[PDB]
Design a protein around this ligand. Sequence first.
Ligand SMILES: Nc1ncnc2c1ncn2[C@H]1C[C@H](O)[C@@H](COP(=O)(O)O)O1
Length: 246
Amino acid sequence: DVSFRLSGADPRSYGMFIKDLRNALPFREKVYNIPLLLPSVSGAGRYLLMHLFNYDGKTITVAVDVTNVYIMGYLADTTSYFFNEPAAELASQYVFRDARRKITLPYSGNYERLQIAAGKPREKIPIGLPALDSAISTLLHYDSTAAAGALLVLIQTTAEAARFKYIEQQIQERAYRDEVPSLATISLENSWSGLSKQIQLAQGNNGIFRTPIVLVDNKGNRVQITNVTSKVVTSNIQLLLNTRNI
Ligand SMILES: Nc1ncnc2c1ncn2[C@H]1C[C@H](O)[C@@H](COP(=O)(O)O)O1
């Protein structure tokens, strides 16, 4: 398991939690010095538990698929909550089995669906550590519309920060003041599967992308990623989604 306490949190302690989350995900191989997530994990070991505590010490436990860093669902007191998708249904067989009832949220966990359920695209929802405090407070007690926004904040501040060092640093900048994600943040979140695919294929193509990836960089500017010496591959990406799961 990994934990993050918002009470007393600072950029350093958030950075330690994201390091904890990345290190809980198993890998057998690195490709260009980046951990390659596993094709597959049978049974209960597939799911990592993240214990998150709001400013007031109230807690949720979030279940995370270790092959793709996808949040499946979460435990608040005696109620489990799962996304309306087959992989979350599967997770509910292994995690949160001492729960009084199980609510299937009325949406899948993908970004397009959560955005429709929340009524706002990610482009317009402030992110940061205070936002994660609010998200944890929202999820303690069922509210499906409120929970869509809260889940968009939870995913970006945990899973997306684990996947990209730049996103971790953007949340550190937002330790005490929320701000809509940067253009580079939304670009990287949208591009993780594509970059993961092109980095694995570059093994066999002399570190050259078979299909170049269009991103936004830290200065707001277009950058075309054509090969593995790019800063996105050498510094930024921290985990690779396995080609088998693309
Ligand atoms: N539930 C959940 N958990 C973890 N990560 C998530 C989740 N939903 C979306 N995302 C992340 C993961 C995808 O690689 C990416 C989708 O971006 P896009 O280009 O918009 O499809 O953002």
